Every structure is written in structure tokens, then in C-alpha cells.
Symmetry: C2
Subunit: 151 residues, 2 copies
């Protein structure tokens, strides 16, 4: 794909639509997520596009390079590690990301994988417990969607 | 991918879980769809994995070869044309398909595309009208899901 889209859904108030575009050699990630608590929320590509057990069956973060969890600017990060989206007082987080590791084709393709927004801020792998190095302590998955080819 | 999965959801009673496995040069499609009226129901891969407008934003049957609509055993068929699933009196259709045209990788890859189950039987391009030649007269989209990568 050159364009992809993801509709985030869960059991609670959180919803969103995420768009992806292969621009130049990078992927531009845009959209919005609504119904969030104010502040940062972990935002990641999870390995499986599998919603059979809700957002749980999406598996861990997309990680073809077998690294520990990090922030999007880190060398040591998962390919899926897109950092945090930040909700305002109205519950709206505007997604605006350009990422060097994700792709919409080949080895790094996130098509058919899952976008997940989480309950808590991602500590970007700097929390100092084992959990930080896996998920950034971002906690439960509020909404997710399988990433699909868009027109 | 080598395995894929789709969760079909819509605005009514119909839902399902469809699994896909690359086997030799085919894709094995298994699963079930529940909440259907008894009888045949059109079942196709559609072009976009785009659920922003429910099943409508999936677009047409996946058709990279620009062919007319057919049944899965026809030479003249869309890549996405998987025929019908058949619901019993209890409303359960068991999906058991082997298809050589859809793929889980490359040009005919259905990863990131949308599986759709329909209101009416698919006449397999044999209804004698113009619509038959596009959609098999399978009617409304009861449920759909983006096909994602599975473990
Ligand atoms: Cu995540
Ligand atoms: Cu269809
Ligand atoms: Zn991670
Ligand atoms: Zn067709």
C-alpha cells in the first residue's frame, strides 16, 4: 500500500481514525482519537491484526528487529513504538507523526497489523522496571483497529 | 503473511471469524459466520481495508486483474470472489474454502483488505443482468472486517 487507514475501537468511550501515507521513504501518521483522559497515551503498532479476543489478540508491539521497547526517536525501540498521543481537556488527541521504522510495504509493513492506543503514558522505555522495556508502562489497550489498505 | 484472520462485524446480528492459511499455492479460508438467514450469502474480499464508513468504505470486490464478477471456480472472476457461504436454520455458516487466486503475500495479497458477507446469494456472474457481472446480486453488506496478520 501507499495509503492505509485504521479505525480504533474498544469497549469504552475511546475511538479514533488513523491515516497512514508513504511519503518519500517515510510514513506519515495522522488522524485523531477521541474520548481519552487528558494527557499522554501510549500509541503503538502491535504485531497481529487479530481482534478475535479484542485488543488483546493484537499481541506485543510490532518488533521485527527484536529490540527492547523505546521511544520513537530511540535507536533501541520496537518498529511499532510510535510514542504517545496527547489528549486535551476535551478528550481529543490529534495524531501527527512521521516515523522512520514503520512501512506500508515489505519487511516493516504495518498493513494487516494493529494500531493500539493505551490507558496510560508510554514512558518510552525509561521507567526502570521490566515492564518499561516491553510496553513503556502504557497499560491497558483502550481502542485498537486492524490497519488496512486505503484508497 | 502465512496466516491471517478477520473479524466480521456490522450493524445487525451478523458476525463471524474467518481464518486464512497459505497452503501450497492456495489460501485455505476457514471459520464461521453466525446470525445469518438460512441459505446462501455472497462472500468476497473487497479492495480496501477501510471501515471509516462501515462496510461501504471497503469498496468493490478486490479486482486487480480488471475482470468481470464470477464464482470462485470461474476463469473470469475477481480475485476476491469466494462465492457463497451457506447458513443453516440456526443461522450459522461454516466457511470452508480453498482458493488459488487470493494470496497472503505479494500482488494478490488480501492482508489489509476487507472480507464481506452479504444479504443475498451471489449468483456467480450468472444472473443474466448487468449487476450479476459486478456483484453477483449479493445485495447488502451484512458484516465486514479488515484481514490482519495472525500468529
Ligand atoms: Cu500499544
Ligand atoms: Cu462482497
Ligand atoms: Zn514497544
Ligand atoms: Zn466479484
Amino acid at each position: 500500500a501507499t495509503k492505509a487507514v485504521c479505525v480504533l475501537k474498544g469497549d469504552g468511550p475511546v475511538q479514533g481514525t488513523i491515516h497512514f501515507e508513504a511519503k518519500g521513504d517515510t510514513v506519515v501518521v495522522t488522524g485523531s482519537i477521541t474520548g481519552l483522559t487528558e494527557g499522554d497515551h501510549g500509541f503503538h503498532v502491535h504485531q497481529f491484526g487479530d481482534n478475535t479476543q479484542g485488543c488483546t489478540s493484537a499481541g506485543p508491539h510490532f518488533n521485527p528487529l527484536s529490540k527492547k521497547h523505546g521511544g520513537p526517536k530511540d535507536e533501541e525501540r520496537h518498529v511499532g513504538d510510535l510514542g504517545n498521543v496527547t489528549a486535551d481537556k476535551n478528550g481529543v488527541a490529534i495524531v501527527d507523526i512521521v516515523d522512520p521504522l514503520i512501512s506500508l510495504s515489505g519487511e516493516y509493513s504495518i498493513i494487516g497489523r494493529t494500531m493500539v492506543v493505551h490507558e496510560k503514558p508510554d514512558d518510552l522505555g525509561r521507567g526502570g522496571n521490566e515492564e518499561s522495556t516491553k510496553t513503556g508502562n502504557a497499560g491497558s489497550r483502550l481502542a485498537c483497529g486492524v490497519i488496512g489498505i486505503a484508497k
